[PDB]
XYZ file of C-alpha atoms in Angstrom:
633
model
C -6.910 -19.493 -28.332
C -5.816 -23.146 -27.725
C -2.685 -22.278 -25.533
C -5.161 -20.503 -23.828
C -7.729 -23.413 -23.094
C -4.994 -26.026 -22.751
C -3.139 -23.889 -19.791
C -6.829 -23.491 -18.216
C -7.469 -27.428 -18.585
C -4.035 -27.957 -16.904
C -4.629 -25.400 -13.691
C -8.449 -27.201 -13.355
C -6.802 -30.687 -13.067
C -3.810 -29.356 -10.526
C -6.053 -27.463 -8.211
C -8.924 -29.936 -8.694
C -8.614 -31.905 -5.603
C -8.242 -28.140 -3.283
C -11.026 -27.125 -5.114
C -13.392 -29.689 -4.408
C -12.752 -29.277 -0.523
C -14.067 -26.122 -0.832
C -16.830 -27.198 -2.537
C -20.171 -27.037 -0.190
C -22.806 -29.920 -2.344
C -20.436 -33.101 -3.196
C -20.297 -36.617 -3.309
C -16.112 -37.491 -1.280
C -14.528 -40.378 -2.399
C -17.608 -42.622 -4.273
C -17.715 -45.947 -4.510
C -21.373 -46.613 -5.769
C -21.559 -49.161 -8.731
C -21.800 -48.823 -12.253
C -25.416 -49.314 -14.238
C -26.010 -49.312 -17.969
C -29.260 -47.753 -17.409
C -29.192 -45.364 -14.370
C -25.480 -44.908 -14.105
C -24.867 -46.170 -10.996
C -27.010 -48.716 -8.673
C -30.056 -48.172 -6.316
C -31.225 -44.504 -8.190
C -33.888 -43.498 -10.233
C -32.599 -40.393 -11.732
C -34.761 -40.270 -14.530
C -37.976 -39.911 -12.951
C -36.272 -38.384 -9.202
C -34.494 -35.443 -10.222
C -32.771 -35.592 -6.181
C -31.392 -38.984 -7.347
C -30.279 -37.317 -10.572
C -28.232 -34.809 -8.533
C -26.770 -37.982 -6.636
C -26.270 -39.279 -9.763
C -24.294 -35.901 -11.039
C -22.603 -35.394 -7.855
C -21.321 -38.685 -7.454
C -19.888 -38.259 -11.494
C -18.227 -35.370 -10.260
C -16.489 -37.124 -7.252
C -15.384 -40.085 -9.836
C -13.969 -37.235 -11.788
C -11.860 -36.360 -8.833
C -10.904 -39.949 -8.101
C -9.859 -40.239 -11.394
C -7.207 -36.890 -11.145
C -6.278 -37.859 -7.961
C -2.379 -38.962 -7.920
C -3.166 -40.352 -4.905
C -5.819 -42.445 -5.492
C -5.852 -45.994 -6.483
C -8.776 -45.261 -9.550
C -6.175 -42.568 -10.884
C -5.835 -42.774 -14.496
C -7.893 -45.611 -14.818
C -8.861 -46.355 -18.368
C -11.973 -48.298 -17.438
C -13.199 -45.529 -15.052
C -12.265 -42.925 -18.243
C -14.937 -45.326 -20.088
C -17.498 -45.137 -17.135
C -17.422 -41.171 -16.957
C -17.626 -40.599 -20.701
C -20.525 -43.436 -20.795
C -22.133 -42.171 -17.792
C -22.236 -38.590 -19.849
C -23.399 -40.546 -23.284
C -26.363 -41.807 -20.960
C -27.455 -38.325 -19.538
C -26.980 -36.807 -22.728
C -29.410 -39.541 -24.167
C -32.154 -38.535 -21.912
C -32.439 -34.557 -22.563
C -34.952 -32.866 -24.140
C -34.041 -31.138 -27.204
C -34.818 -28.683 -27.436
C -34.957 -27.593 -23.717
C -37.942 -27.222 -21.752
C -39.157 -23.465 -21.214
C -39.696 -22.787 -17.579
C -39.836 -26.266 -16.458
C -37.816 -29.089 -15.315
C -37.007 -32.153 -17.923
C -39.077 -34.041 -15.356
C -40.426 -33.578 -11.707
C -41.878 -30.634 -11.155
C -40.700 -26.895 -11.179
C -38.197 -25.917 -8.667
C -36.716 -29.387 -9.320
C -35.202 -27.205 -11.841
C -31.673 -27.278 -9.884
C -29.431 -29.871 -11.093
C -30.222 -29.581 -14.596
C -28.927 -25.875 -14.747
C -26.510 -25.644 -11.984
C -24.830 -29.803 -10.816
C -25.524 -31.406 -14.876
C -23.316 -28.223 -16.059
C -20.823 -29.371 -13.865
C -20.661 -33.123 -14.685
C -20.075 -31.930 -17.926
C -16.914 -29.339 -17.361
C -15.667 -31.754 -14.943
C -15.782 -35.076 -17.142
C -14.376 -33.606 -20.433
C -11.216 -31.702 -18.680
C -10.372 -34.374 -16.171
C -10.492 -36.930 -19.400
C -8.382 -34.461 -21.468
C -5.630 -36.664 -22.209
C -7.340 -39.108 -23.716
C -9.726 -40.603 -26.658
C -12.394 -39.802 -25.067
C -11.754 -35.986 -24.791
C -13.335 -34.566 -28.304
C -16.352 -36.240 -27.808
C -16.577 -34.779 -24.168
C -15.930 -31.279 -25.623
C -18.667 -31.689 -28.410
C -21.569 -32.833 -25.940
C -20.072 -29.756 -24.413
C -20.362 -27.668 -26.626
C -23.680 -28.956 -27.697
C -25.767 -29.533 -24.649
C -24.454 -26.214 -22.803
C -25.163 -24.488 -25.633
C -28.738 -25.685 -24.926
C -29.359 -25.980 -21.343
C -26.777 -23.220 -21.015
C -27.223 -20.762 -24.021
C -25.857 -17.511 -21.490
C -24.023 -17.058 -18.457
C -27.328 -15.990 -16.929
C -30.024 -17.977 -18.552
C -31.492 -21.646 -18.103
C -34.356 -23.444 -19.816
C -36.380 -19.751 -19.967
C -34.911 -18.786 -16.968
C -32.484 -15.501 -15.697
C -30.827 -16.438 -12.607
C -28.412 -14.099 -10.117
C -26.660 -14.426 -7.397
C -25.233 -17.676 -5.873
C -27.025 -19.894 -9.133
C -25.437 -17.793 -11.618
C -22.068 -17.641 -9.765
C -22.294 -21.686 -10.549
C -23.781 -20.914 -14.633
C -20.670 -18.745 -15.058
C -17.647 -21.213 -14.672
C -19.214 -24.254 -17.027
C -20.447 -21.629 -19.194
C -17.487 -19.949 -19.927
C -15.396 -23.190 -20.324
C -18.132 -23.587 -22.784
C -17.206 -20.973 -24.671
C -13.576 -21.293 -24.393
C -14.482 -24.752 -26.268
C -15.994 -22.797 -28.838
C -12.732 -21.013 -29.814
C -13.968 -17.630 -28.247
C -10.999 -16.006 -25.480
C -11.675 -14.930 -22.030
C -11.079 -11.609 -23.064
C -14.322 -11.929 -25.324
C -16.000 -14.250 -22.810
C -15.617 -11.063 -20.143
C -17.693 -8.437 -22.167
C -20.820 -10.884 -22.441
C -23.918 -9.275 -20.889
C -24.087 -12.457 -18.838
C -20.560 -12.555 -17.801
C -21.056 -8.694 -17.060
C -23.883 -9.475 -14.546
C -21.581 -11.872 -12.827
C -18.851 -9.561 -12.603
C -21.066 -7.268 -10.912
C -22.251 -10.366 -8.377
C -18.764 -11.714 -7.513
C -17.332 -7.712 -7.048
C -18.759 -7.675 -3.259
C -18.065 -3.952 -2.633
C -18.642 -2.924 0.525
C -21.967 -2.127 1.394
C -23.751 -0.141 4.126
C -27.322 -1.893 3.677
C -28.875 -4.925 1.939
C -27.749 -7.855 0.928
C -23.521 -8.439 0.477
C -20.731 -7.612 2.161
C -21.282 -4.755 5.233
C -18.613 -2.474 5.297
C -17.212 -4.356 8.544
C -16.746 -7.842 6.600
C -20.080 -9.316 7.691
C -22.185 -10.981 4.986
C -25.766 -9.908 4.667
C -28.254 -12.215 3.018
C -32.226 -12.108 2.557
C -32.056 -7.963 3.081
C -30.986 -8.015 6.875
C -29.982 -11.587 8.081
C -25.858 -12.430 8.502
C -25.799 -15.916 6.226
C -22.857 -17.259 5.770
C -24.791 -20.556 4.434
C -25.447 -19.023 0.784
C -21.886 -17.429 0.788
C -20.389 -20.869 1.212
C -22.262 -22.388 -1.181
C -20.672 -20.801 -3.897
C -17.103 -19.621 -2.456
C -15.694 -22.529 -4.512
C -16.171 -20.639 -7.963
C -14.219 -17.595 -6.482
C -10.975 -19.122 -7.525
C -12.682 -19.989 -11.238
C -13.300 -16.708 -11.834
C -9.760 -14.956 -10.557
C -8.348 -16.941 -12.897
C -10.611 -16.192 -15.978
C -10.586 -12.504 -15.025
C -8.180 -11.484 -12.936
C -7.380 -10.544 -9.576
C -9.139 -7.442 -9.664
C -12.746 -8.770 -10.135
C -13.324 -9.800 -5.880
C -13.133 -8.400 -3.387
C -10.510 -10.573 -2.217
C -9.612 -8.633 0.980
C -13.366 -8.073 1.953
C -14.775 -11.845 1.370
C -11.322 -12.835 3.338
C -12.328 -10.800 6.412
C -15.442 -11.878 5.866
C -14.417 -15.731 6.566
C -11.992 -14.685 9.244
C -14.748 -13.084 10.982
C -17.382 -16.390 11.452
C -14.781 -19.486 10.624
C -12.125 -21.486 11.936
C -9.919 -24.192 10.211
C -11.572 -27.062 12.338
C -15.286 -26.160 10.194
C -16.756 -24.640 13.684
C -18.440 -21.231 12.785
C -21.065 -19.589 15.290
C -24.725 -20.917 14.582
C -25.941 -17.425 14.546
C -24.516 -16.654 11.171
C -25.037 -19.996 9.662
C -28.130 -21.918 8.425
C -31.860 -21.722 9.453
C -31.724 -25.486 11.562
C -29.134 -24.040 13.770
C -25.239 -25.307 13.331
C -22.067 -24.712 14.134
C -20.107 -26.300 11.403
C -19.018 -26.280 7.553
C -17.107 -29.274 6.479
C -15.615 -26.659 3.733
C -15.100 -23.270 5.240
C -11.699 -24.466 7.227
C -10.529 -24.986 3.451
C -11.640 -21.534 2.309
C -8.082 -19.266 4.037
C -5.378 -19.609 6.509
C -6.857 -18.286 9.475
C -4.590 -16.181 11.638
C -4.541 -16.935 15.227
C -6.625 -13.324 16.530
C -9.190 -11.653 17.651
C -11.939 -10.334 14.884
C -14.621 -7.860 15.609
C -17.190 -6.356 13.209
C -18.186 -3.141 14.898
C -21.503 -2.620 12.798
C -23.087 -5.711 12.313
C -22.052 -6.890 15.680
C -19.590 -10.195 15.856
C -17.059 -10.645 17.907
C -14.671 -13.712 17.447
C -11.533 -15.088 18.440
C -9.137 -18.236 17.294
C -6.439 -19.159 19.896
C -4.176 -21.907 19.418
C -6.682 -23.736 22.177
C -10.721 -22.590 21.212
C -12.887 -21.117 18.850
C -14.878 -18.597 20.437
C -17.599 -15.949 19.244
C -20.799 -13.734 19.822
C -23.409 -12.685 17.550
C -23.901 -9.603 19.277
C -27.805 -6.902 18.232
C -28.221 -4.398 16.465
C -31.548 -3.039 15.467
C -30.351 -2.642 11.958
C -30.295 -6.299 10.853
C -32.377 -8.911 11.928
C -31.845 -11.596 15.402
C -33.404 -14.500 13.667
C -34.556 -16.001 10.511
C -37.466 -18.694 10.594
C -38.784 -20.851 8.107
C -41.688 -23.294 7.545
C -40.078 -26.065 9.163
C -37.304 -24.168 11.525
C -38.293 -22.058 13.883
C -36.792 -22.742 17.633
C -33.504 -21.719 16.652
C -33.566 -17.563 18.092
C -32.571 -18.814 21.528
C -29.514 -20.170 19.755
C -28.911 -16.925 17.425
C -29.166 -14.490 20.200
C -27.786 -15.927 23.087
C -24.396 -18.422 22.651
C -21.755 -17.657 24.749
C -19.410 -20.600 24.423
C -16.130 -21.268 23.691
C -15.167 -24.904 21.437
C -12.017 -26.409 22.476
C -10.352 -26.845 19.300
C -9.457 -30.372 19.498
C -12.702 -31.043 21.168
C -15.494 -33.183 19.668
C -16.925 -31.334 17.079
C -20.843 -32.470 18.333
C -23.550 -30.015 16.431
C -26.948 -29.457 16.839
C -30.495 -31.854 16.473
C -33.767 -30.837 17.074
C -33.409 -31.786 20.548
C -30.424 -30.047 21.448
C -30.921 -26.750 19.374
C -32.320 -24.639 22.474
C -29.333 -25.535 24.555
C -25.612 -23.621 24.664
C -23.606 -21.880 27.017
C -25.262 -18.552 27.464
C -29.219 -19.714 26.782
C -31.377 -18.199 28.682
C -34.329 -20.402 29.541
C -38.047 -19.135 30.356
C -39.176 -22.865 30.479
C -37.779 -25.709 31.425
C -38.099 -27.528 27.973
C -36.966 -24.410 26.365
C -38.647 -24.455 23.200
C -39.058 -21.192 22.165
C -40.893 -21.197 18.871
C -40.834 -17.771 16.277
C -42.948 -19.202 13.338
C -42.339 -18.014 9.878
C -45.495 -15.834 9.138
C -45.014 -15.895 5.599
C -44.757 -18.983 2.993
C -41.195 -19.183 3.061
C -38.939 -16.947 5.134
C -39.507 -14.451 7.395
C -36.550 -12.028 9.356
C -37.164 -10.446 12.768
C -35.563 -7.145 13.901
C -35.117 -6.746 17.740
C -37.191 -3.800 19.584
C -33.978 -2.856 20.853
C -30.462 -3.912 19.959
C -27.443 -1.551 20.918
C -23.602 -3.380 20.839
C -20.174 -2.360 21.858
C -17.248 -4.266 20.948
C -13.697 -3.240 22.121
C -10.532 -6.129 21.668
C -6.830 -5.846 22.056
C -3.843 -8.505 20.590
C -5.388 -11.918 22.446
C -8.746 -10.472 24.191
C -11.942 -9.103 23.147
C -14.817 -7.763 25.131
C -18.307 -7.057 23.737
C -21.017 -5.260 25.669
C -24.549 -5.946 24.195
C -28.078 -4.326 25.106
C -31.202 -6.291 23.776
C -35.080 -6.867 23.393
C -37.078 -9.248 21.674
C -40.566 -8.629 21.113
C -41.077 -12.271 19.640
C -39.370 -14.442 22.680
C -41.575 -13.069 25.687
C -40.278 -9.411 25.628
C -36.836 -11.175 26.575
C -34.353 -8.246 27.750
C -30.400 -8.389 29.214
C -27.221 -6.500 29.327
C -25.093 -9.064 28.197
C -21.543 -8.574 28.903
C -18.886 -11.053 27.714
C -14.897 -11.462 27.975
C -12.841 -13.723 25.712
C -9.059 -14.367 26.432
C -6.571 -16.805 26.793
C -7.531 -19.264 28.010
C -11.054 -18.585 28.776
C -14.034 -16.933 28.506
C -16.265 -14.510 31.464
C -20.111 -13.956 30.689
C -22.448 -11.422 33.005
C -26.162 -11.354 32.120
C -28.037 -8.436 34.244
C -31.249 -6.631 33.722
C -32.268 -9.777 32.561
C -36.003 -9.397 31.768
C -39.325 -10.664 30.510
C -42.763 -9.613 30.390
C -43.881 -8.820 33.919
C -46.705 -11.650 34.906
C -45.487 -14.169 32.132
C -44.129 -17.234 33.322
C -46.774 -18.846 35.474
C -44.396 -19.119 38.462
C -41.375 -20.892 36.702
C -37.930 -19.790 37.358
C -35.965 -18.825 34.614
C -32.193 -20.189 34.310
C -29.252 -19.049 32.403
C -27.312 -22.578 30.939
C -23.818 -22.841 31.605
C -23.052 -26.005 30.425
C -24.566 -28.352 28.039
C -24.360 -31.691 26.552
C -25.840 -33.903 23.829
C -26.565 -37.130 25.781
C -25.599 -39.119 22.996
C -22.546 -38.074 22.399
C -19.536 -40.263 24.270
C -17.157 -37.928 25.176
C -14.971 -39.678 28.190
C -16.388 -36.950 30.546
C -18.322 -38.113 32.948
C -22.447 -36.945 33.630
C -22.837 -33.363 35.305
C -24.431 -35.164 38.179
C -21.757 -37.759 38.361
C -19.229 -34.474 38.252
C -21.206 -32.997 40.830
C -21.153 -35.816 43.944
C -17.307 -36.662 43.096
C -16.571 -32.652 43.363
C -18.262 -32.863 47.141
C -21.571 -32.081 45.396
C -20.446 -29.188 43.775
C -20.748 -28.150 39.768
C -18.018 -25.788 40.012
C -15.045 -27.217 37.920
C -17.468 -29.552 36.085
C -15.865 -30.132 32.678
C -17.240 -30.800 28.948
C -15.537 -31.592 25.859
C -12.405 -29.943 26.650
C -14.342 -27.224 28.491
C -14.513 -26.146 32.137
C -17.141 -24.073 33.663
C -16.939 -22.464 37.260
C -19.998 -19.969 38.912
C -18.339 -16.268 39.063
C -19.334 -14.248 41.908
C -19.523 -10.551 42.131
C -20.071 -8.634 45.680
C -23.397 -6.866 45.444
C -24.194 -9.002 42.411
C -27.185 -11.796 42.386
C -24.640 -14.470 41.017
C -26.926 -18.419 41.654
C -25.392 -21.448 42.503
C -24.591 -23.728 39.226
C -27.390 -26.741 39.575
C -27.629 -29.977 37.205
C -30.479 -30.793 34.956
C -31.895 -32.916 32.659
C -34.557 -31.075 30.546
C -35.001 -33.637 27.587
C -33.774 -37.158 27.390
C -31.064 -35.505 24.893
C -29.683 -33.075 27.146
C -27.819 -32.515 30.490
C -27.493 -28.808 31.632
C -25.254 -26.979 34.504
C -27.247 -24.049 34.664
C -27.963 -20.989 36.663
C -31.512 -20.820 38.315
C -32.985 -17.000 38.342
C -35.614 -15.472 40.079
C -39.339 -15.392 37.902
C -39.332 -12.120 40.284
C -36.702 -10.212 39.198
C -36.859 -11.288 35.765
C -40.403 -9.189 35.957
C -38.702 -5.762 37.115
C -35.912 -6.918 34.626
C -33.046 -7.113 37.398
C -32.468 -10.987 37.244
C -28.220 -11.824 36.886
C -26.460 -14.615 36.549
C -22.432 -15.206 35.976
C -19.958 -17.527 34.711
C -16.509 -18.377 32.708
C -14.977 -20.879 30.855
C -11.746 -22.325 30.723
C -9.843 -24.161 28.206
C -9.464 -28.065 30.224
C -5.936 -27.838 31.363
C -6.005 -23.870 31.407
C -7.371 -22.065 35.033
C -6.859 -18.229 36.098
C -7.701 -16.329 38.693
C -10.249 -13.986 36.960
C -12.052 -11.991 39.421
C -14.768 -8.773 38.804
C -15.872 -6.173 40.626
C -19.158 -3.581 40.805
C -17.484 -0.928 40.670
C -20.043 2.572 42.387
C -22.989 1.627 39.965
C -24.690 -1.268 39.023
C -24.053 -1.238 35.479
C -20.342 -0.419 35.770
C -18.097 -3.773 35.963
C -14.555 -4.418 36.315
C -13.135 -7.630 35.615
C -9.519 -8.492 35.987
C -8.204 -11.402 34.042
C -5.213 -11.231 36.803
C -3.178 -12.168 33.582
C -2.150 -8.489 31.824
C -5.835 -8.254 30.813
C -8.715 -5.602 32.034
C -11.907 -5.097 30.810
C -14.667 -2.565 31.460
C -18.362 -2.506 31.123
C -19.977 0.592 31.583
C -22.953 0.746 29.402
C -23.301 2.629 26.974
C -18.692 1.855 26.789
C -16.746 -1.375 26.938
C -13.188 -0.875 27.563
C -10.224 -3.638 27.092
C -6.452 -2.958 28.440
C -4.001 -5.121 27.248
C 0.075 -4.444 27.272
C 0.212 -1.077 25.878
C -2.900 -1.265 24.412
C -6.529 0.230 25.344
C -9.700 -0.033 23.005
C -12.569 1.788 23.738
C -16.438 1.282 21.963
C -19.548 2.991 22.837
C -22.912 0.860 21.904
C -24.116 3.859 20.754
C -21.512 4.171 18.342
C -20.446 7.635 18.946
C -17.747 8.599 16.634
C -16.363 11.042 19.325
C -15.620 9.791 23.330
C -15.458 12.087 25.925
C -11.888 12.352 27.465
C -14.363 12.086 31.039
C -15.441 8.603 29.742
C -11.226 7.473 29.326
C -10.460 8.900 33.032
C -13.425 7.880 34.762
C -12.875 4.210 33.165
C -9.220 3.939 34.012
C -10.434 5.733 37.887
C -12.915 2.499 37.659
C -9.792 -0.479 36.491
C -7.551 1.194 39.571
C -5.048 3.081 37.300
C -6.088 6.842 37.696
C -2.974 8.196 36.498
C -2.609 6.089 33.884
C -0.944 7.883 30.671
C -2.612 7.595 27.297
C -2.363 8.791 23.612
C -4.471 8.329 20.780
C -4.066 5.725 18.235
C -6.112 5.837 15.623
C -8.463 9.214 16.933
C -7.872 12.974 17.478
C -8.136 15.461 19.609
C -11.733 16.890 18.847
C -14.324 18.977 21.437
C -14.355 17.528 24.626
C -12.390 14.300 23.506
C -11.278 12.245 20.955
C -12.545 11.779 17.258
C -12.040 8.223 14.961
C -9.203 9.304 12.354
C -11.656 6.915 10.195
C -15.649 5.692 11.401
C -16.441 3.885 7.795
C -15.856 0.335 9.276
C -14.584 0.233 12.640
C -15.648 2.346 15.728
C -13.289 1.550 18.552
C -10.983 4.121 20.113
C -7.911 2.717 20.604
C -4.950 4.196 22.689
C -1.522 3.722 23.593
C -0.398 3.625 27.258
C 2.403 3.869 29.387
């Protein structure tokens, strides 16, 4: 099997560099010095197991410095000395045998390193060192130490592990066999390696954690968490190779990235960790992302990447959970449930502190701090599902509309139709029925943010307020970041003036002020866009009979509809329909009095991807997506 093992040696050191971008914990590009005694200077890794993971993940990097053609360290036989030393020193400080259900030192559940990062140091020191004298020695404290600390695929110093951990196990481990003599085809029907065939598979599911059949990936039983998906996306490639194509889901997890990601790192903070980002400094490295609109129909995202902005919305359903709180973050719902912002794409990528996490485009503020605070009631995690959460998404080739219905029992009985446009080059948002528990804000207006800024941050834009006197005291216009917000009003509508605020010493806010009144009968509304800087239109929308039923015009080949419980978008030829009901059937009364309500009555349709079927149409297929869509003329 040494043809075998030599041709898997050579693809590791090729794609070794690409594989490390997509790697989520590293060390990039270390220069830290060498030390006899701790490896490298300033760490105590032999009493602080975190400095022993800086200690393995700055190895690692070395290792990548040293394959790198590029780099000036590459090939260097005195760096080939340090790695191989620098493994002769960890080696020399392992317990033999292993420790059972307990860390070599520090306490438990300082138990990561040793069986996921140390693994690592070891594959990547022996293969990047192949080529040289130091390589059989490498492969024998391989061989031995794995065999210890590593003895399965699956197991670690008395421990089983699944999911993301033993996704990181399997690709030392089986390295560590392939050192061994054994092939990959024996190395596949290992219990272990059996386990992680079923882990890495991600069929599509309909509940629970993995991949929902719309591409959406469900962590923690019912929270979207792209955070632990990352994590160990680099290994994905590992195991192709070792097993196949066949073995992933390659299709799914790829919609699955194309769904939440962009190549700039900037991913929508309500799929993303528990202290509330926006951006991955390896998921741009994971595809090439098309330029398009995305929606997930059942777990409720819509998200588009134009050649100018990166734009999404976590929309509600009462299937999965609005927010995810922990012992230390819990202020980050306003941000899950209610962004509606678009990033300029060669904008600033600025992401969130703890001063600046209750304030994006789209917030809707019931204080004027806005700390809105969901505690974790348990010792770790705890998930909350909304009272109500009903979604409609409907997108054509460059636009997407999504139509959301909401209530959260944990932020003040917080209600709103939310109704949101994205296109090129901009982005519409109506909030009405915006709600909260009658009597409950002691007199305090509530306001719906528009714009926001991070303080710190020098962009060459000047302050809101500055924006505000030079524009004849107006915000309209006033620009951020390479974005441009203007007020949006609609006749018979309650649209407020944009006003400028400072809530924190962080943050400046454009923001519309609403009623404490109307938020109590749950009628409050406010409206907005935003434009790509450089890009205007003349967007304009319309009540249209009823209050709920809203007609916006783009003005540039794009309508949309909101008529809850249906969105509608028209673009070219093309007309998608959703109810946020998710009826599998629509009522051909629904397409005529929607195109009646756009201005195009006798508009001529046919069916797309539906049927003819009782008093409408029928989905030729529900199992993942649930928009209509029709051709028109």
């Amino acid at each position: 099997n040494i043809q075998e093992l030599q041709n898997f040696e050579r693809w590791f050191k090729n794609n070794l560099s690409y594989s490390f971008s997509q790697k989520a914990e590293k060390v990039v590009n270390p220069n830290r010095n060498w030390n006899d005694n701790t490896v490298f200077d300033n760490l105590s890794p032999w009493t602080s197991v975190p400095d022993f993971g800086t200690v393995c993940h700055t190895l690692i990097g070395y290792c990548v410095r040293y394959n790198n053609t590029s780099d000036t360290l590459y090939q260097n036989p005195e760096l080939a000395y340090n790695l191989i030393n620098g493994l002769r020193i960890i080696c020399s400080k392992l317990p033999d045998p292993p420790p059972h259900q307990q860390a070599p030192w520090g306490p438990v559940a300082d138990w990561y390193h040793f069986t996921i990062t140390m693994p690592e140091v070891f594959m990547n020191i022996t293969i990047v060192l192949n080529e040289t004298q130091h390589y059989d020695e490498a492969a024998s404290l391989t061989r031995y130490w794995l065999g210890l600390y590593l003895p399965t695929a699956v197991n670690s110093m008395g421990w089983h592990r699944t999911a993301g951990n033993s996704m990181r196990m399997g690709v030392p481990y089986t390295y560590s066999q392939m050192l061994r003599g054994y092939s990959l085809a024996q190395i596949r029907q290992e219990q272990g390696i059996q386990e992680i065939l079923n882990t890495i598979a991600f069929p599509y599911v309909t509940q629970g954690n993995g991949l929902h059949v719309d591409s959406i990936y469900i962590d923690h039983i019912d929270v979207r968490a792209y955070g632990y998906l990352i994590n160990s996306y680099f290994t994905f490639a590992y195991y192709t190779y070792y097993f196949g194509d066949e073995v992933i889901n390659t299709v799914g997890l790829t919609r699955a990235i194309e769904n939440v990601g962009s190549p700039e790192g900037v991913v929508v903070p309500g799929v993303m960790s528990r202290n509330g980002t926006l951006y991955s400094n390896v998921i741009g490295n994971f595809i090439t992302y098309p330029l398009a609109v995305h929606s997930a129909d059942y777990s409720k995202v819509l998200t588009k990447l134009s050649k100018t902005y990166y734009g999404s919305v976590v929309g509600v359903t009462n299937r999965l959970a609005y927010y995810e709180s922990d012992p230390t973050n819990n202020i980050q719902a306003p941000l899950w449930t209610m962004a509606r912002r678009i990033w300029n794409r060669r904008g600033r990528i600025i992401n969130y502190n703890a001063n600046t996490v209750s304030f994006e485009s789209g917030i809707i503020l019931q204080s004027l701090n806005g700390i809105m605070r969901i505690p974790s009631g348990t010792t770790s995690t705890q998930s909350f599902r909304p009272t109500i959460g009903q979604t409609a998404i409907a997108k054509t080739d460059t636009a997407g509309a999504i139509l959301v219905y909401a209530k959260f029992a944990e932020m003040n009985n917080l209600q709103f139709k939310s109704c949101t446009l994205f296109y090129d080059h901009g982005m519409f948002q109506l909030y009405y029925n915006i709600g909260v528990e009658p009597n409950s804000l002691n007199n305090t207006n509530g306001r719906v943010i528009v714009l926001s800024r991070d303080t710190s941050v020098n962009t060459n834009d000047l302050s809101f307020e500055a924006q505000r006197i030079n524009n004849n005291n107006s915000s309209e216009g006033t620009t951020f970041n390479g974005v441009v917000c203007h007020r949006v009003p609609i006749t018979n509508i309650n649209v407020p003036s944009l006003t400028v605020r400072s809530p924190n010493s962080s943050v400046e806010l454009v923001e519309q002020i609403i009623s404490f009144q109307t938020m109590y009968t749950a009628t409050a509304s406010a409206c907005y866009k935003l434009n790509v800087e450089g890009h205007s239109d003349s967007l304009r929308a319309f009540r249209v009979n009823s209050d709920e039923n809203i007609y916006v015009n783009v003005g540039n080949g794009v309508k949309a509809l909101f008529n809850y419980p249906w969105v509608m978008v028209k673009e070219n030829n093309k007309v998608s329909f959703m109810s946020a009901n998710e009826d599998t059937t629509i009522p051909f009364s629904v397409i005529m009095n929607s195109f009646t309500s756009i201005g195009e009555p006798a508009l001529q349709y046919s069916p797309s991807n539906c049927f003819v079927y009782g008093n409408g149409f029928k989905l030729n297929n529900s199992t993942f997506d649930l928009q209509f869509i029709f051709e028109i003329v």
